[PDB]
Amino acid sequence: GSHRTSGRVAVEEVDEEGKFVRLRNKSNEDQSMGNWQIKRQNGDDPLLTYRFPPKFTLKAGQVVTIWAAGAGATHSPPTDLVWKAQNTWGCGNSLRTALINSTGEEVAMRKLV
User: Fold this and answer.
1) Fewest beta carbons within 10 Å, which of 3, 7, 8, 104?
2) Which residues make Cβ contacts (< 8 Å) with residue 100, sequence separation at least 6?
């Protein structure tokens, strides 16, 4: 899919089955992601927003997968986090997933069409 990565963290994969979104710190430096968020736009549906914990660090070169509540995954930081507010990330023909920092700036995205 389409994508953009500014900074250390990229949206590496967006599951078409809506079970997860995987991010990867492609840099050699750790990244603070406290209060960051992921905005998901499925087709013409209202935006879904996942917020990272108030404190969280994605270490250099590492990945973190954010699972929806009905994906059969267990909260296991720092490699896997579970989003309790939504059972699915959503499915469709056009899915846009954006990684937003703590001040509202989009730093990365991945879009499927």
Assistant:
1) 104
2) 36, 37, 38, 39, 106, 107
The C-alpha atoms of residue 49 and residue 64 are separated, in whole angstroms, by 17
DSSP 55: S
Note the resolution in Å, 1 decimal.
1.4
The structure's method of determination equals: X-ray
Overall number of domains in the chain = 1
- Do 109 and 11 contact (CB within 8 A), yes or no? yes
For 102, the token pair is 């703590």
Q: List C-alpha distances in Å: 69 to 28, 57, 63, 106.
A: 31, 22, 19, 24
Distances (CA, A) of 91 to 29, 30, 49, 63, 67: 33, 31, 15, 23, 14
Neighbouring C-beta atoms of residue 31, cutoff 10 Å: 19
CATH number of 101's domain: 2.60.40.1260
